[PDB]
Amino acid sequence: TATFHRCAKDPWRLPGTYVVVLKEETHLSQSERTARRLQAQAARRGYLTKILHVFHGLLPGFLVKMSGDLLELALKLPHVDYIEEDSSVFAQ
Amino acid sequence: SIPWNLERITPPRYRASLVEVYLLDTSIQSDHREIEGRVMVTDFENVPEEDSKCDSHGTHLAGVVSGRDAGVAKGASMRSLRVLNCQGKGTVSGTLIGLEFIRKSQLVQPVGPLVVLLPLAGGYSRVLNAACQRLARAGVVLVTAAGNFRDDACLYSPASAPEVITVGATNAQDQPVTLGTLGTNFGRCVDLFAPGEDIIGASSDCSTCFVSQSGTSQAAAHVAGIAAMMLSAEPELTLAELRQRLIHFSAKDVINEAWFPEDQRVLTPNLVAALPPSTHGWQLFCRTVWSAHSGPTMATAIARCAPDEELLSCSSFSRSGKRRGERMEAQGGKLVCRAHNAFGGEGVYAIARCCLLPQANCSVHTAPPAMGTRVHCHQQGHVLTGCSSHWEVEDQPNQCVGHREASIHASCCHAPGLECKVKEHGIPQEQVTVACEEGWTLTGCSALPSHVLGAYAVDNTCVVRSRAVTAVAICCRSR
Numbered sequence A: 001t002a003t004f005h006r007c008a009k010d011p012w013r014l015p016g017t018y019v020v021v022l023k024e025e026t027h028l029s030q031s032e033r034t035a036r037r038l039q040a041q042a043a044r045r046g047y048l049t050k051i052l053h054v055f056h057g058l059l060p061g062f063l064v065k066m067s068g069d070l071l072e073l074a075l076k077l078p079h080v081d082y083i084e085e086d087s088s089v090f091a092q
Numbered sequence B: 001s002i003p004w005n006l007e008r009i010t011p012p013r014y015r016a017s018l019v020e021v022y023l024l025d026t027s028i029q030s031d032h033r034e035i036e037g038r039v040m041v042t043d044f045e046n047v048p049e050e051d052s053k054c055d056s057h058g059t060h061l062a063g064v065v066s067g068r069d070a071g072v073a074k075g076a077s078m079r080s081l082r083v084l085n086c087q088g089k090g091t092v093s094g095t096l097i098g099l100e101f102i103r104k105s106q107l108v109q110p111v112g113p114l115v116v117l118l119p120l121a122g123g124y125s126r127v128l129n130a131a132c133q134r135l136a137r138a139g140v141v142l143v144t145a146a147g148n149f150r151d152d153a154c155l156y157s158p159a160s161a162p163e164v165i166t167v168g169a170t171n172a173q174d175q176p177v178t179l180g181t182l183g184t185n186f187g188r189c190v191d192l193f194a195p196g197e198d199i200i201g202a203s204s205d206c207s208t209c210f211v212s213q214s215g216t217s218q219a220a221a222h223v224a225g226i227a228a229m230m231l232s233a234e235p236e237l238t239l240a241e242l243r244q245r246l247i248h249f250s251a252k253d254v255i256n257e258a259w260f261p262e263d264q265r266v267l268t269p270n271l272v273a274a275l276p277p278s279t280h281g282w283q284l285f286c287r288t289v290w291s292a293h294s295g296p297t298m299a300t301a302i303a304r305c306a307p308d309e310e311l312l313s314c315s316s317f318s319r320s321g322k323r324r325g326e327r328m329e330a331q332g333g334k335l336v337c338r339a340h341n342a343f344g345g346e347g348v349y350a351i352a353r354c355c356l357l358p359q360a361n362c363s364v365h366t367a368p369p370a371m372g373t374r375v376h377c378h379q380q381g382h383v384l385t386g387c388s389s390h391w392e393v394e395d396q397p398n399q400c401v402g403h404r405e406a407s408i409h410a411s412c413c414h415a416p417g418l419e420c421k422v423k424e425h426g427i428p429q430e431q432v433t434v435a436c437e438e439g440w441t442l443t444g445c446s447a448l449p450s451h452v453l454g455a456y457a458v459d460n461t462c463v464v465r466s467r468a469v470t471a472v473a474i475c476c477r478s479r
Protein backbone atom coordinates (compact mmCIF):
# COMPACT_ATOMS: atom_id res chain seq x y z
CA THR A 1 0.00 0.00 0.00
CA ALA A 2 3.00 2.41 0.62
CA THR A 3 4.09 4.56 -2.38
CA PHE A 4 7.30 6.30 -3.49
CA HIS A 5 7.52 9.89 -4.78
CA ARG A 6 10.37 11.99 -6.09
CA CYS A 7 10.47 15.58 -7.40
CA ALA A 8 9.27 15.89 -11.07
CA LYS A 9 12.01 18.60 -11.67
CA ASP A 10 15.06 16.36 -12.19
CA PRO A 11 17.74 19.09 -11.43
CA TRP A 12 16.00 19.72 -8.01
CA ARG A 13 16.14 16.09 -6.76
CA LEU A 14 18.47 15.15 -3.91
CA PRO A 15 18.88 11.29 -4.19
CA GLY A 16 20.29 9.46 -1.19
CA THR A 17 18.06 11.33 1.35
CA TYR A 18 14.45 10.16 1.96
CA VAL A 19 11.57 11.29 4.14
CA VAL A 20 9.77 8.22 5.47
CA VAL A 21 6.18 9.21 6.29
CA LEU A 22 4.21 6.90 8.60
CA LYS A 23 0.41 6.44 9.05
CA GLU A 24 -1.50 9.35 10.72
CA GLU A 25 -1.92 8.04 14.31
CA THR A 26 1.61 6.47 14.57
CA HIS A 27 3.38 7.24 17.90
CA LEU A 28 6.87 8.71 18.31
CA SER A 29 7.97 5.37 19.96
CA GLN A 30 6.76 3.40 16.88
CA SER A 31 8.50 5.92 14.48
CA GLU A 32 11.78 5.40 16.31
CA ARG A 33 11.36 1.61 16.30
CA THR A 34 10.58 1.71 12.50
CA ALA A 35 13.75 3.74 11.91
CA ARG A 36 15.94 1.32 14.02
CA ARG A 37 14.34 -1.74 12.29
CA LEU A 38 15.26 -0.15 8.89
CA GLN A 39 18.88 0.46 10.05
CA ALA A 40 19.09 -3.16 11.36
CA GLN A 41 17.67 -4.68 8.08
CA ALA A 42 20.01 -2.41 6.06
CA ALA A 43 23.07 -3.58 8.10
CA ARG A 44 22.14 -7.31 7.62
CA ARG A 45 22.40 -6.52 3.85
CA GLY A 46 25.67 -4.53 4.06
CA TYR A 47 24.29 -0.97 3.73
CA LEU A 48 25.21 2.02 5.90
CA THR A 49 22.28 4.28 6.90
CA LYS A 50 22.02 7.44 8.93
CA ILE A 51 18.86 8.55 10.79
CA LEU A 52 19.13 12.36 10.49
CA HIS A 53 15.91 13.34 12.27
CA VAL A 54 12.74 11.79 13.66
CA PHE A 55 9.52 13.76 13.01
CA HIS A 56 6.66 14.22 15.52
CA GLY A 57 4.11 16.98 16.17
CA LEU A 58 3.14 17.55 12.52
CA LEU A 59 3.60 14.25 10.66
CA PRO A 60 5.05 10.96 12.05
CA GLY A 61 8.14 9.63 10.36
CA PHE A 62 11.84 10.22 9.99
CA LEU A 63 14.59 11.45 7.70
CA VAL A 64 17.13 8.83 6.45
CA LYS A 65 20.44 9.13 4.53
CA MET A 66 20.77 5.80 2.60
CA SER A 67 21.16 4.18 -0.84
CA GLY A 68 17.97 4.02 -2.96
CA ASP A 69 18.50 0.21 -3.17
CA LEU A 70 16.74 -0.07 0.24
CA LEU A 71 13.53 1.60 -0.95
CA GLU A 72 11.72 -1.73 -1.71
CA LEU A 73 12.60 -2.94 1.82
CA ALA A 74 11.65 0.47 3.46
CA LEU A 75 8.24 0.37 1.68
CA LYS A 76 7.52 -2.97 3.40
CA LEU A 77 8.22 -1.59 6.96
CA PRO A 78 5.17 -1.48 9.31
CA HIS A 79 3.23 1.83 9.60
CA VAL A 80 4.79 3.25 6.37
CA ASP A 81 2.30 5.54 4.48
CA TYR A 82 4.76 6.79 1.79
CA ILE A 83 8.39 7.72 1.10
CA GLU A 84 9.55 10.84 -0.67
CA GLU A 85 13.03 11.49 -1.99
CA ASP A 86 14.42 14.85 -0.67
CA SER A 87 14.44 17.85 -3.01
CA SER A 88 15.51 21.48 -3.22
CA VAL A 89 13.54 24.63 -2.29
CA PHE A 90 14.57 28.16 -3.43
CA ALA A 91 14.03 31.76 -2.19
CA GLN A 92 11.30 33.40 -4.36
CA SER B 1 7.34 60.20 -0.18
CA ILE B 2 5.13 57.00 0.14
CA PRO B 3 6.32 53.77 -1.60
CA TRP B 4 3.84 52.88 -4.39
CA ASN B 5 3.13 49.40 -2.83
CA LEU B 6 2.11 50.81 0.54
CA GLU B 7 -0.25 53.19 -1.28
CA ARG B 8 -1.57 50.28 -3.45
CA ILE B 9 -2.69 48.21 -0.38
CA THR B 10 -4.31 51.39 1.16
CA PRO B 11 -8.16 51.13 0.77
CA PRO B 12 -10.28 54.02 -0.77
CA ARG B 13 -11.46 54.88 2.80
CA TYR B 14 -9.23 54.37 5.80
CA ARG B 15 -9.27 55.22 9.53
CA ALA B 16 -5.48 55.96 9.43
CA SER B 17 1.36 42.87 18.45
CA LEU B 18 -0.85 40.05 19.84
CA VAL B 19 0.12 38.32 16.49
CA GLU B 20 3.58 36.87 15.78
CA VAL B 21 4.93 36.36 12.22
CA TYR B 22 7.38 33.49 11.69
CA LEU B 23 9.63 33.85 8.65
CA LEU B 24 11.31 30.75 7.04
CA ASP B 25 14.10 32.14 4.89
CA THR B 26 17.87 32.99 4.87
CA SER B 27 19.75 34.49 7.86
CA ILE B 28 18.65 38.04 8.73
CA GLN B 29 20.42 41.25 9.94
CA SER B 30 18.38 41.52 13.23
CA ASP B 31 20.03 44.86 14.13
CA HIS B 32 18.78 46.74 10.94
CA ARG B 33 16.97 49.91 12.18
CA GLU B 34 13.75 48.89 10.34
CA ILE B 35 13.34 45.74 12.53
CA GLU B 36 15.75 46.04 15.57
CA GLY B 37 14.15 44.91 18.84
CA ARG B 38 11.15 43.40 17.00
CA VAL B 39 12.84 40.35 15.41
CA MET B 40 13.81 37.21 17.34
CA VAL B 41 16.47 35.16 15.53
CA THR B 42 16.10 31.56 16.67
CA ASP B 43 19.47 30.75 15.00
CA PHE B 44 17.92 27.35 14.11
CA GLU B 45 20.04 26.25 11.16
CA ASN B 46 18.99 23.64 8.59
CA VAL B 47 20.74 24.68 5.38
CA PRO B 48 22.58 22.69 2.65
CA GLU B 49 26.31 23.44 1.90
CA GLU B 50 26.95 26.40 -0.48
CA ASP B 51 27.95 24.79 -3.84
CA SER B 52 25.32 41.01 3.89
CA LYS B 53 24.98 38.76 0.76
CA CYS B 54 23.74 35.84 2.97
CA ASP B 55 21.06 37.99 4.83
CA SER B 56 19.94 39.93 1.69
CA HIS B 57 16.65 38.05 1.03
CA GLY B 58 15.51 37.52 4.63
CA THR B 59 16.36 41.08 5.89
CA HIS B 60 14.35 42.63 3.00
CA LEU B 61 11.26 40.41 3.77
CA ALA B 62 11.40 41.08 7.56
CA GLY B 63 11.43 44.78 6.53
CA VAL B 64 8.46 44.43 4.08
CA VAL B 65 6.37 42.72 6.78
CA SER B 66 7.21 44.80 9.87
CA GLY B 67 9.72 47.62 9.08
CA ARG B 68 9.32 50.97 10.96
CA ASP B 69 9.36 53.10 7.78
CA ALA B 70 8.65 50.86 4.73
CA GLY B 71 6.77 47.94 6.42
CA VAL B 72 3.11 46.77 6.05
CA ALA B 73 2.46 45.85 9.75
CA LYS B 74 4.81 48.44 11.36
CA GLY B 75 6.31 47.16 14.60
CA ALA B 76 4.84 43.57 14.31
CA SER B 77 6.81 40.97 16.35
CA MET B 78 8.81 38.58 14.20
CA ARG B 79 10.67 35.27 14.60
CA SER B 80 13.06 34.04 11.87
CA LEU B 81 14.20 30.45 11.13
CA ARG B 82 17.06 29.93 8.71
CA VAL B 83 16.12 27.23 6.14
CA LEU B 84 17.87 28.78 3.11
CA ASN B 85 21.62 29.04 2.56
CA CYS B 86 23.75 32.00 1.28
CA GLN B 87 22.54 31.26 -2.28
CA GLY B 88 18.85 31.13 -1.14
CA LYS B 89 18.78 27.32 -1.51
CA GLY B 90 17.21 24.87 0.96
CA THR B 91 15.58 21.40 1.09
CA VAL B 92 12.03 20.05 1.60
CA SER B 93 13.46 18.10 4.66
CA GLY B 94 14.98 21.28 6.20
CA THR B 95 11.69 23.14 5.52
CA LEU B 96 9.74 20.35 7.29
CA ILE B 97 12.09 20.56 10.31
CA GLY B 98 11.50 24.35 10.54
CA LEU B 99 7.71 23.90 10.31
CA GLU B 100 7.90 21.20 13.01
CA PHE B 101 10.05 23.57 15.16
CA ILE B 102 7.24 26.17 14.94
CA ARG B 103 4.63 23.67 16.15
CA LYS B 104 6.94 22.51 19.02
CA SER B 105 7.67 26.13 20.06
CA GLN B 106 3.93 26.82 20.10
CA LEU B 107 3.25 23.68 22.24
CA VAL B 108 5.97 24.68 24.77
CA GLN B 109 5.01 28.41 24.96
CA PRO B 110 1.53 29.26 23.52
CA VAL B 111 0.93 32.85 22.31
CA GLY B 112 -1.87 34.34 20.19
CA PRO B 113 -2.53 33.91 16.43
CA LEU B 114 0.53 32.86 14.39
CA VAL B 115 1.22 33.84 10.74
CA VAL B 116 3.95 31.81 8.96
CA LEU B 117 5.56 33.28 5.92
CA LEU B 118 7.12 30.77 3.51
CA PRO B 119 8.82 32.85 0.77
CA LEU B 120 10.24 29.79 -0.96
CA ALA B 121 9.25 27.11 -3.51
CA GLY B 122 10.24 23.71 -4.93
CA GLY B 123 8.37 21.25 -7.16
CA TYR B 124 5.07 19.69 -6.06
CA SER B 125 5.86 17.82 -2.79
CA ARG B 126 3.39 15.49 -1.06
CA VAL B 127 5.16 15.64 2.29
CA LEU B 128 5.56 19.47 2.21
CA ASN B 129 1.83 19.91 1.39
CA ALA B 130 0.81 17.40 4.15
CA ALA B 131 3.01 19.25 6.71
CA CYS B 132 1.28 22.56 5.71
CA GLN B 133 -2.17 20.86 6.14
CA ARG B 134 -1.24 19.70 9.67
CA LEU B 135 0.17 23.11 10.66
CA ALA B 136 -2.98 24.82 9.30
CA ARG B 137 -5.26 22.19 11.10
CA ALA B 138 -3.37 23.09 14.30
CA GLY B 139 -4.72 26.68 13.86
CA VAL B 140 -1.67 28.34 12.12
CA VAL B 141 -1.97 30.76 9.08
CA LEU B 142 0.44 29.98 6.25
CA VAL B 143 1.21 32.57 3.59
CA THR B 144 3.29 31.42 0.64
CA ALA B 145 4.92 32.79 -2.51
CA ALA B 146 3.25 31.46 -5.68
CA GLY B 147 6.72 31.07 -7.29
CA ASN B 148 8.66 33.10 -9.91
CA PHE B 149 8.54 30.53 -12.75
CA ARG B 150 5.81 32.10 -14.99
CA ASP B 151 4.01 28.79 -14.54
CA ASP B 152 0.95 27.15 -12.93
CA ALA B 153 1.33 27.48 -9.13
CA CYS B 154 -0.28 23.94 -8.71
CA LEU B 155 3.01 22.30 -9.91
CA TYR B 156 4.95 23.84 -6.94
CA SER B 157 5.05 23.43 -3.15
CA PRO B 158 4.08 24.86 -0.61
CA ALA B 159 2.24 27.04 -3.28
CA SER B 160 -0.17 24.16 -4.11
CA ALA B 161 -1.14 23.15 -0.51
CA PRO B 162 -4.95 23.68 -0.34
CA GLU B 163 -4.78 25.11 3.17
CA VAL B 164 -2.19 27.87 2.56
CA ILE B 165 -2.74 31.42 1.18
CA THR B 166 -0.71 31.50 -2.18
CA VAL B 167 0.27 34.98 -3.39
CA GLY B 168 1.16 36.04 -6.93
CA ALA B 169 3.13 39.22 -7.78
CA THR B 170 1.82 42.45 -9.49
CA ASN B 171 3.65 45.71 -10.43
CA ALA B 172 2.88 49.51 -10.21
CA GLN B 173 0.64 49.23 -13.28
CA ASP B 174 -1.33 46.33 -11.53
CA GLN B 175 0.18 43.95 -14.10
CA PRO B 176 1.76 40.50 -13.44
CA VAL B 177 5.48 40.83 -12.59
CA THR B 178 7.97 39.78 -15.26
CA LEU B 179 11.34 38.65 -13.83
CA GLY B 180 13.34 38.73 -17.10
CA THR B 181 12.45 35.62 -19.14
CA LEU B 182 10.31 34.37 -16.23
CA GLY B 183 7.98 36.06 -13.65
CA THR B 184 4.96 35.50 -11.38
CA ASN B 185 3.23 32.10 -11.22
CA PHE B 186 -0.56 31.96 -11.77
CA GLY B 187 -3.59 29.63 -11.97
CA ARG B 188 -6.35 28.21 -9.66
CA CYS B 189 -3.85 27.63 -6.83
CA VAL B 190 -3.22 31.38 -6.41
CA ASP B 191 -5.57 33.06 -3.85
CA LEU B 192 -4.75 36.67 -4.87
CA PHE B 193 -1.93 38.97 -6.02
CA ALA B 194 -0.02 41.69 -4.17
CA PRO B 195 2.76 44.29 -4.91
CA GLY B 196 5.89 42.36 -5.84
CA GLU B 197 7.95 44.60 -8.15
CA ASP B 198 10.28 47.46 -7.00
CA ILE B 199 9.54 46.97 -3.30
CA ILE B 200 11.73 49.15 -1.17
CA GLY B 201 12.88 47.42 2.04
CA ALA B 202 15.79 46.93 4.47
CA SER B 203 19.16 46.05 2.86
CA SER B 204 21.63 43.89 4.85
CA ASP B 205 24.57 46.02 3.46
CA CYS B 206 24.28 48.50 6.39
CA SER B 207 21.82 49.08 9.32
CA THR B 208 20.10 52.12 7.62
CA CYS B 209 20.45 51.01 3.98
CA PHE B 210 17.47 50.22 1.67
CA VAL B 211 17.13 48.17 -1.51
CA SER B 212 14.28 47.55 -3.95
CA GLN B 213 13.55 43.85 -4.64
CA SER B 214 11.00 41.96 -6.79
CA GLY B 215 9.25 38.57 -6.65
CA THR B 216 6.40 36.47 -5.19
CA SER B 217 8.40 36.51 -1.86
CA GLN B 218 7.82 40.31 -1.63
CA ALA B 219 4.18 39.89 -2.70
CA ALA B 220 3.63 37.20 0.06
CA ALA B 221 5.29 39.44 2.68
CA HIS B 222 2.61 42.11 1.93
CA VAL B 223 -0.19 39.52 2.58
CA ALA B 224 1.45 38.29 5.84
CA GLY B 225 1.55 41.96 6.97
CA ILE B 226 -2.14 42.41 5.99
CA ALA B 227 -3.14 39.06 7.64
CA ALA B 228 -1.23 40.07 10.87
CA MET B 229 -3.19 43.37 10.96
CA MET B 230 -6.53 41.64 10.28
CA LEU B 231 -5.73 39.11 13.11
CA SER B 232 -4.71 41.83 15.58
CA ALA B 233 -8.11 43.50 14.97
CA GLU B 234 -10.24 40.21 14.97
CA PRO B 235 -8.13 37.52 16.76
CA GLU B 236 -10.94 34.88 16.62
CA LEU B 237 -10.80 34.69 12.79
CA THR B 238 -10.31 31.14 11.56
CA LEU B 239 -8.24 30.55 8.37
CA ALA B 240 -11.44 30.31 6.19
CA GLU B 241 -12.62 33.69 7.56
CA LEU B 242 -9.24 35.37 7.04
CA ARG B 243 -8.96 34.05 3.45
CA GLN B 244 -12.51 35.33 2.66
CA ARG B 245 -11.68 38.80 4.07
CA LEU B 246 -8.39 39.13 2.04
CA ILE B 247 -10.44 38.27 -1.14
CA HIS B 248 -13.36 40.59 -0.14
CA PHE B 249 -11.15 43.63 0.56
CA SER B 250 -8.95 43.16 -2.57
CA ALA B 251 -9.09 45.48 -5.63
CA LYS B 252 -11.04 43.56 -8.33
CA ASP B 253 -10.56 43.24 -12.13
CA VAL B 254 -7.48 45.54 -12.33
CA ILE B 255 -5.21 42.82 -13.85
CA ASN B 256 -5.12 42.51 -17.68
CA GLU B 257 -5.63 38.71 -17.94
CA ALA B 258 -4.08 38.75 -21.52
CA TRP B 259 -0.58 38.35 -19.85
CA PHE B 260 -1.58 34.84 -18.63
CA PRO B 261 -1.70 31.86 -21.06
CA GLU B 262 -5.24 31.37 -22.56
CA ASP B 263 -6.38 28.39 -20.40
CA GLN B 264 -5.12 30.10 -17.21
CA ARG B 265 -7.09 33.32 -17.70
CA VAL B 266 -10.39 32.11 -16.17
CA LEU B 267 -8.75 30.06 -13.37
CA THR B 268 -6.52 32.98 -12.18
CA PRO B 269 -8.06 35.37 -9.55
CA ASN B 270 -8.09 38.98 -10.72
CA LEU B 271 -7.39 40.37 -7.23
CA VAL B 272 -4.75 42.69 -5.81
CA ALA B 273 -4.52 42.63 -1.95
CA ALA B 274 -5.47 45.63 0.20
CA LEU B 275 -5.98 46.41 3.89
CA PRO B 276 -9.64 46.50 5.10
CA PRO B 277 -11.25 50.01 5.36
CA SER B 278 -11.80 49.70 9.17
CA THR B 279 -10.83 47.38 12.13
CA HIS B 280 -14.62 46.65 12.68
CA GLY B 281 -21.94 44.42 10.58
CA TRP B 282 -22.55 40.84 9.34
CA GLN B 283 -21.88 40.46 5.59
CA LEU B 284 -22.01 37.40 3.28
CA PHE B 285 -18.53 36.43 2.03
CA CYS B 286 -18.25 34.11 -1.05
CA ARG B 287 -15.40 33.05 -3.27
CA THR B 288 -15.00 30.76 -6.29
CA VAL B 289 -12.98 27.52 -6.16
CA TRP B 290 -11.87 25.83 -9.42
CA SER B 291 -11.09 22.09 -9.36
CA ALA B 292 -8.23 20.36 -11.27
CA HIS B 293 -9.14 19.52 -14.89
CA SER B 294 -10.97 16.11 -15.00
CA GLY B 295 -8.74 14.68 -17.78
CA PRO B 296 -9.71 13.33 -21.27
CA THR B 297 -11.17 10.01 -19.83
CA MET B 298 -16.44 9.20 -18.10
CA ALA B 299 -13.92 11.69 -16.53
CA THR B 300 -15.12 13.71 -13.53
CA ALA B 301 -13.70 16.81 -11.77
CA ILE B 302 -14.37 17.59 -8.09
CA ALA B 303 -14.43 21.05 -6.40
CA ARG B 304 -14.99 21.20 -2.60
CA CYS B 305 -14.94 24.07 -0.10
CA ALA B 306 -12.42 24.38 2.73
CA PRO B 307 -13.39 23.38 6.37
CA ASP B 308 -15.67 26.11 7.94
CA GLU B 309 -17.10 26.98 4.44
CA GLU B 310 -20.43 26.14 2.87
CA LEU B 311 -20.79 25.26 -0.77
CA LEU B 312 -23.75 27.35 -2.07
CA SER B 313 -23.53 26.54 -5.76
CA CYS B 314 -21.88 24.47 -8.45
CA SER B 315 -21.09 25.08 -12.12
CA SER B 316 -18.81 23.57 -14.80
CA PHE B 317 -16.71 24.65 -17.79
CA SER B 318 -15.23 23.05 -20.98
CA ARG B 319 -13.35 25.02 -23.72
CA SER B 320 -14.89 22.74 -26.43
CA GLY B 321 -18.33 22.61 -24.77
CA LYS B 322 -18.16 18.81 -24.57
CA ARG B 323 -19.68 18.28 -21.08
CA ARG B 324 -22.59 16.52 -19.31
CA GLY B 325 -23.00 19.28 -16.65
CA GLU B 326 -22.56 19.09 -12.90
CA ARG B 327 -24.20 17.88 -9.71
CA MET B 328 -24.04 18.94 -6.07
CA GLU B 329 -23.85 15.90 -3.76
CA ALA B 330 -23.34 15.15 -0.05
CA GLN B 331 -20.02 13.51 1.06
CA GLY B 332 -19.07 13.11 4.74
CA GLY B 333 -21.97 15.43 5.58
CA LYS B 334 -20.63 18.15 3.21
CA LEU B 335 -21.76 19.29 -0.27
CA VAL B 336 -19.32 18.68 -3.12
CA CYS B 337 -19.46 19.89 -6.70
CA ARG B 338 -18.94 17.15 -9.35
CA ALA B 339 -18.59 17.92 -13.07
CA HIS B 340 -18.93 15.37 -15.93
CA ASN B 341 -17.09 15.08 -19.25
CA ALA B 342 -18.78 14.04 -22.57
CA PHE B 343 -17.72 11.83 -25.60
CA GLY B 344 -14.59 13.25 -27.27
CA GLY B 345 -14.30 16.00 -24.64
CA GLU B 346 -10.78 17.08 -23.57
CA GLY B 347 -12.11 17.35 -19.99
CA VAL B 348 -14.13 19.58 -17.65
CA TYR B 349 -13.64 21.84 -14.62
CA ALA B 350 -15.99 21.74 -11.61
CA ILE B 351 -16.50 25.33 -10.20
CA ALA B 352 -17.79 25.77 -6.64
CA ARG B 353 -18.99 28.89 -4.83
CA CYS B 354 -17.74 28.77 -1.19
CA CYS B 355 -19.28 31.02 1.45
CA LEU B 356 -19.12 31.71 5.18
CA LEU B 357 -22.64 30.88 6.34
CA PRO B 358 -22.52 29.67 9.99
CA GLN B 359 -25.22 27.25 11.33
CA ALA B 360 -26.67 27.12 7.76
CA ASN B 361 -26.90 23.44 6.84
CA CYS B 362 -27.08 23.76 3.05
CA SER B 363 -28.83 20.72 1.61
CA VAL B 364 -29.47 19.50 -1.98
CA HIS B 365 -32.95 18.91 -3.54
CA THR B 366 -32.58 16.66 -6.63
CA ALA B 367 -35.10 15.83 -9.36
CA PRO B 368 -34.15 13.34 -12.16
CA PRO B 369 -35.67 13.94 -15.70
CA ALA B 370 -39.45 13.24 -16.06
CA MET B 371 -42.13 21.08 -19.37
CA GLY B 372 -38.53 20.85 -18.07
CA THR B 373 -37.23 19.40 -14.75
CA ARG B 374 -38.23 21.33 -11.58
CA VAL B 375 -37.37 21.42 -7.84
CA HIS B 376 -37.92 24.12 -5.10
CA CYS B 377 -36.82 25.20 -1.56
CA HIS B 378 -40.22 25.15 0.26
CA GLN B 379 -39.38 25.86 3.90
CA GLN B 380 -39.72 28.96 6.13
CA GLY B 381 -36.32 30.66 6.48
CA HIS B 382 -34.85 28.69 3.55
CA VAL B 383 -33.21 30.34 0.52
CA LEU B 384 -32.28 28.91 -2.90
CA THR B 385 -28.51 29.66 -3.29
CA GLY B 386 -27.67 27.64 -6.43
CA CYS B 387 -29.01 25.52 -9.36
CA SER B 388 -27.03 22.67 -10.97
CA SER B 389 -27.84 20.44 -13.91
CA HIS B 390 -26.43 17.18 -15.33
CA TRP B 391 -27.49 14.85 -18.17
CA GLU B 392 -26.67 11.12 -18.49
CA VAL B 393 -26.88 11.30 -22.37
CA GLU B 394 -24.93 13.45 -24.93
CA ASP B 395 -26.48 16.23 -27.16
CA GLN B 396 -40.18 31.26 -10.20
CA PRO B 397 -38.57 32.42 -6.87
CA ASN B 398 -36.68 29.61 -4.99
CA GLN B 399 -37.15 27.25 -8.03
CA CYS B 400 -34.54 25.62 -10.39
CA VAL B 401 -35.36 24.87 -14.04
CA GLY B 402 -33.49 22.45 -16.34
CA HIS B 403 -33.77 20.68 -19.73
CA ARG B 404 -36.40 17.88 -20.14
CA GLU B 405 -33.64 15.17 -20.39
CA ALA B 406 -31.53 16.45 -17.43
CA SER B 407 -31.47 16.04 -13.63
CA ILE B 408 -31.78 19.32 -11.68
CA HIS B 409 -30.09 20.01 -8.30
CA ALA B 410 -30.86 22.86 -5.92
CA SER B 411 -28.85 24.06 -2.99
CA CYS B 412 -31.28 25.12 -0.25
CA CYS B 413 -29.94 26.88 2.84
CA HIS B 414 -31.45 27.67 6.21
CA ALA B 415 -30.68 31.43 6.41
CA PRO B 416 -33.56 33.58 7.82
CA GLY B 417 -31.38 36.71 7.90
CA LEU B 418 -30.77 36.37 4.15
CA GLU B 419 -32.57 38.06 1.27
CA CYS B 420 -31.90 36.57 -2.21
CA LYS B 421 -32.81 37.76 -5.74
CA VAL B 422 -32.43 36.07 -9.16
CA LYS B 423 -31.14 38.44 -11.86
CA GLU B 424 -31.33 37.08 -15.46
CA HIS B 425 -29.67 38.72 -18.51
CA GLY B 426 -29.86 37.46 -22.10
CA ILE B 427 -28.32 38.93 -25.31
CA PRO B 428 -28.92 37.98 -29.02
CA GLN B 429 -22.32 36.18 -28.64
CA GLU B 430 -19.20 34.40 -27.18
CA GLN B 431 -19.82 35.76 -23.61
CA VAL B 432 -22.86 36.97 -21.61
CA THR B 433 -22.35 38.48 -18.15
CA VAL B 434 -24.63 39.68 -15.30
CA ALA B 435 -23.44 41.31 -12.06
CA CYS B 436 -25.07 41.47 -8.61
CA GLU B 437 -25.57 45.08 -7.54
CA GLU B 438 -23.12 46.67 -5.00
CA GLY B 439 -23.77 45.36 -1.46
CA TRP B 440 -25.04 42.00 -2.80
CA THR B 441 -22.97 38.77 -3.04
CA LEU B 442 -23.25 36.38 -5.97
CA THR B 443 -24.02 32.93 -4.47
CA GLY B 444 -24.84 31.15 -7.73
CA CYS B 445 -24.18 31.50 -11.40
CA SER B 446 -25.74 29.44 -14.25
CA ALA B 447 -26.84 29.35 -17.94
CA LEU B 448 -30.63 29.40 -18.59
CA PRO B 449 -31.76 26.21 -20.46
CA SER B 450 -27.42 28.32 -28.41
CA HIS B 451 -24.81 25.90 -26.87
CA VAL B 452 -22.96 26.87 -23.63
CA LEU B 453 -19.31 26.01 -22.87
CA GLY B 454 -20.02 26.81 -19.23
CA ALA B 455 -20.65 29.31 -16.45
CA TYR B 456 -18.50 30.63 -13.62
CA ALA B 457 -18.65 33.46 -11.13
CA VAL B 458 -15.85 36.13 -11.36
CA ASP B 459 -16.17 38.06 -7.99
CA ASN B 460 -19.90 39.19 -8.06
CA THR B 461 -20.32 38.79 -11.84
CA CYS B 462 -21.83 35.64 -13.39
CA VAL B 463 -20.03 34.70 -16.66
CA VAL B 464 -21.69 32.45 -19.26
CA ARG B 465 -19.54 31.41 -22.25
CA SER B 466 -21.06 30.17 -25.54
CA ARG B 467 -19.68 28.72 -28.83
CA ALA B 468 -30.75 33.23 -27.15
CA VAL B 469 -28.16 32.76 -24.31
CA THR B 470 -29.08 33.89 -20.74
CA ALA B 471 -26.77 34.30 -17.69
CA VAL B 472 -28.67 33.67 -14.41
CA ALA B 473 -27.29 35.09 -11.14
CA ILE B 474 -28.48 34.44 -7.56
CA CYS B 475 -27.60 37.45 -5.34
CA CYS B 476 -27.88 37.47 -1.55
CA ARG B 477 -27.40 40.01 1.27
CA SER B 478 -27.88 40.18 5.05
CA ARG B 479 -31.46 41.54 5.70
Ligand SMILES: COc1cc2c(cc1Oc1ccc(C(=O)O)cc1)[C@@](C)(CC(=O)Nc1nccs1)NCC2
Pocket: B154, B159, B160, B161, B162, B163, B164, B165, B166, B188, B189, B190, B191, B289, B290, B291, B292, B302, B303, B304, B305, B306, B307
Ligand atom coordinates in the same frame (compact mmCIF):
# COMPACT_ATOMS: atom_id res chain seq x y z
C1 LIG C 1 -4.63 22.00 -5.02
O1 LIG C 1 -5.84 22.71 -5.27
C2 LIG C 1 -5.82 23.97 -4.66
C3 LIG C 1 -4.70 24.54 -4.08
C4 LIG C 1 -4.77 25.79 -3.48
C5 LIG C 1 -5.97 26.48 -3.43
C6 LIG C 1 -7.08 25.91 -4.02
C7 LIG C 1 -7.01 24.67 -4.63
O2 LIG C 1 -8.17 24.18 -5.22
C8 LIG C 1 -8.79 23.11 -4.61
C9 LIG C 1 -9.81 22.49 -5.31
C10 LIG C 1 -10.45 21.40 -4.76
C11 LIG C 1 -10.06 20.94 -3.52
C12 LIG C 1 -10.70 19.75 -2.92
O3 LIG C 1 -11.67 19.27 -3.55
O4 LIG C 1 -10.21 19.29 -1.86
C13 LIG C 1 -9.05 21.58 -2.83
C14 LIG C 1 -8.40 22.67 -3.37
C15 LIG C 1 -6.08 27.85 -2.79
C16 LIG C 1 -6.74 28.83 -3.76
C17 LIG C 1 -6.82 27.86 -1.45
C18 LIG C 1 -8.14 27.14 -1.44
O5 LIG C 1 -9.14 27.56 -1.99
N1 LIG C 1 -8.07 25.98 -0.72
C19 LIG C 1 -9.07 25.04 -0.61
N2 LIG C 1 -9.04 24.08 0.29
C20 LIG C 1 -10.16 23.30 0.17
C21 LIG C 1 -11.05 23.67 -0.82
S1 LIG C 1 -10.46 25.05 -1.63
N3 LIG C 1 -4.73 28.42 -2.52
C22 LIG C 1 -3.85 27.43 -1.85
C23 LIG C 1 -3.52 26.36 -2.86
